[PDB]
Symmetry: D2
Subunit: 295 residues, 4 copies
């Protein structure tokens, strides 16, 4: 037998960092969960019990903390690039590093209309994420994403004109609830190394903000013909606004809210134009995906 | 043997309701999870297989939907009172109804600085809850709460002067991170019935808003001597602002963020005044509770 | 204002202990999650920022580890009694200790038909729990439980003869699926102190085993008239088998599996006697509770 | 812009099926969670609001139920192949179907030493899974797996001889706890179609059983030099026992149990050879992966 692929490292490394502005007293906090997996000339640890090639996972953990102490942790695209580059440069036999970062929200509190200098709220379980693959000789590949953005619109969603056959019971509709949890990923053009990543630093936060804004505005304003049609419009707009993105991927569940026929009870009307009370369905759910690129 | 206590009903009933203003086009959505448990002269269903005394749990579910169709679902204190009263009035042998409601956030989206008429975001997993106990002959007891409000302050928290003995390793500190998930409950004076609950309807939303505001402002502004001391200040202020509340209860975890000594690595300084990178701890956690009432 | 109640301590303390038999080489492992909350003359920590009365939660954590090192951790009723007694005896101003223990399963593996001396499997998320309340002057109150025991029977469950009115749509049935997650609690007679708890040590494991056996056998064998009727039979039998138990409480969800009418598709018959494929429902669920005591 | 990839369908479809042996009275239950995603000539649903190419996700759900009614649901490799083949044969414009099945445990209860004919227990959250990709013109690709198998050994695990540099604090050890959650996947050779899958039906359950047995026996018996070395031995043995498997992949977390130094308290010895009480760590965790194939 032979090792066809192998990677190993440390997952679920929770990290907090504070920045203190000595002039103003304002403090800013960052909290992340980090995973680093390494690849390289490590097969003999599997086949021959040769631990000499293993950078211990505990040491990977220490390295995450040290790197966060010595470098900016924002934007996460930069921090993940620094962290990944470290492993391939430090260890001759390590040839790829895969860094995943989940950023948690700590939003500054407003107290009496004023931003508070050192108090924060978790205002959403929405995350901002990065996946950074640093491969020796092949540069740095970055996928940025937002996830856990949960939205609902109560009208201006339709679904008609779909295929009807002997397996079909769904009725066409011109007015339904649309609710989803948005997972959106933008893949950057390959970067040659850390100097090129640093040269683009301003674009990372700006592109995250644009992706979020486009997602929310398009969801709210589109008189949606389907999840498919609405998500394509979102992706097109993101590509138009940032030329350094190569592809945009969306993964959207369709979280169903069913009408409840109450006509058996005193003729109560609660369907169609009279629908007011609905039953949210926990499962099953539709799942719609698309990857959009340039022509 | 004998039945000393019994209650039964339906849990995890998900309910959505939409209100449509025909004049303006503005729609407003409400989403809740409801549990109703009944008590009364039901022991023979347990002891003698006598199902004639059972209002089926499926029928309880139907009743929740019908009641939501025919009545306001907000404030939840009112809806829960209507729902509980229904069971004790409709069924002669049912003498108590226990209604728990969890309200989920659907906050109206702002698009280009304007509130959108029919699009919403789940802006927090914070919940607004009610527990309503309707007992025949004894009125209506309401406990209102907020839960899942997660906050952090990066300084202006201290903890010194605690008991030190042979079990103690904790160092005194004059500057630490304080983070918690707030669970706050206010218990209303007993109401005689639905007419009295209706007479106080404006106070329910106002008191929830006050409880939230006091919690956030006190957390942000107090130079905290302990979780205990800060939570007592919150409770006092809520009692001062609403005379119809009898008690306020807080349950606060102390979610620890530990310093990381990096001095073993090239003498890096990351403790005390030099602490920048911390390790959030998933467990264990402190748990601090208090119930405050009037003198 | 005044403090009406207060308790504080440490939650989610994970503990593992190994026992090694030097004669045989056999090792046995125990893993628990422990919470300890204290009460006593502690109000001034809340009202006056007086930390001198606070046994730090970190010290409570240390005490859990030390107590586990120096004492048996099984049965959990004994360990929780030792731990709770420690706090009220050590600290003059602490007058009650509330200890909750969740025991996790590590079942010895059988390899080639033989029990392995040091390898274990988590064979269920079923838990064995204890709640121990040690109150100065009032002895030791112990509630023992099992939870997370998930069962299903595919026939020999009925539900007919329930109340039918204008809120009822449920059809009577003489053959349905019954599935639940069992939470069963037995409350021991009050014990005067640790000497009396020790005197009854053999009864704790034996009574847990009996409660589990009775639950499973009664569920499997009863031609159930309702959840209510079946759970009462379980409780009666436990009380009959252990005279030192005062009450038994069951809390059972009714986890619904719905028939799927497929007759719209080529006349396929999948209801009633022809039902083979069902839709498990995640929510809502029935919730049935009873507490049974002696006459 | 252009659609580079697209797939859509229904997730989290819960399905139960019962088989009743009329001769013996014995009933057997199966419960699964199914996801089906389709690909094909569907881009215009995204780009042009053309729903005529959409087989509605609701219809996919109906098809899962109908297919389960008309066909065996075990082994899951067969059921997933039937389900996937259905979509590519029924719909000319659908060219791939991706079927994921999670099988939940319902193990027959033993009551008084005898297997009960119709009562079952969820004896583990361990799952048996399949991923079946049916691609028009390219056959059927099946990946079978087990997941959620949680094990611990209290000794006979070592970890020494790893790389030591300025980032390393971990001490070498010759005796530690090893605990993990096993995720093991075996990838079958490509099958030409449903006839070939049916021809191999007996091998599916047998290979699952072998994979489980090899995993448990190797974990229990290996005096482990590292997670890496132990998992490679498991994979080699599975490949040796089933020639129709092309690769085996393991993904193993290293769930750390830390020693607790108690020497600060009365010189208590709880490290090294005296270690009895340990602190299980919820995070971070090591994560070790390998894919093994033939030479
Ligand atoms: O937007 C939708 N897309 C779909 O593919 C679908 N199928 N059922 N409902 C649906 N709604
Ligand atoms: O605010 C705090 N209260 C406590 O009771 C405590 N114990 N350890 N740390 C603590 N912090
Ligand atoms: O066993 C049952 N008990 C109940 O109270 C009930 N209500 N609906 N179905 C039920 N099944
Ligand atoms: O088995 C192990 N493998 C590793 O790669 C490792 N790193 N720290 N500890 C470890 N244990
Ligand atoms: Na390298
Ligand atoms: Na009544
Ligand atoms: Na005392
Ligand atoms: Na086809």
């Amino acid at each position: 037998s032979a090792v066809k692929a192998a990677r190993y490292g440390k997952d679920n490394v929770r990290v907090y960092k504070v920045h203190k502005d000595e002039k103003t007293g304002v403090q800013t906090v960052y909290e992340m969960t980090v995973c680093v997996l390494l690849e390289g000339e490590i097969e003999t640890s599997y086949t021959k019990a040769d631990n000499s090639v293993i950078v211990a996972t505990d040491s990977i953990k220490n390295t995450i903390y040290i790197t966060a102490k010595q470098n900016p942790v924002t934007p996460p695209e930069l921090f993940g690039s620094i962290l990944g580059t470290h492993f391939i440069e430090k260890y001759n036999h390590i040839h790829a590093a895969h860094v995943n970062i989940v950023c948690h929200r700590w939003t500054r509190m407003d107290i009496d209309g004023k931003p508070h200098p050192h108090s924060f709220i978790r205002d959403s379980e929405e995350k901002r994420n990065v996946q950074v693959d640093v491969v020796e000789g092949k540069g740095i590949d970055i996928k940025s994403s937002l996830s856990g953005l949960t939205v609902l619109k109560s009208t201006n969603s339709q679904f008609w004109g779909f295929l009807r056959d002997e397996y079909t019971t769904l009725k066409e509709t011109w007015d339904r609830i649309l609710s989803t949890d948005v997972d959106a990923t933008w893949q950057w053009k390959n970067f040659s190394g850390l100097q090129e990543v640093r040269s683009h630093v301003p674009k990372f936060d700006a592109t995250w903000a644009t992706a979020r804004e486009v997602t929310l505005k398009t969801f709210a304003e589109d008189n949606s013909a389907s999840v498919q049609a609405t998500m394509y419009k979102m992706a097109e707009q993101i590509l138009a606004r940032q030329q350094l993105i190569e592809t945009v991927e969306y993964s959207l569940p369709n979280k169903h809210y069913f009408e409840i026929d109450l006509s058996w009870h005193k003729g109560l009307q609660n369907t169609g134009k009279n629908a007011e009370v609905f039953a949210p369905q926990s499962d099953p759910n539709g799942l719609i995906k698309c990857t959009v690129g340039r022509s």
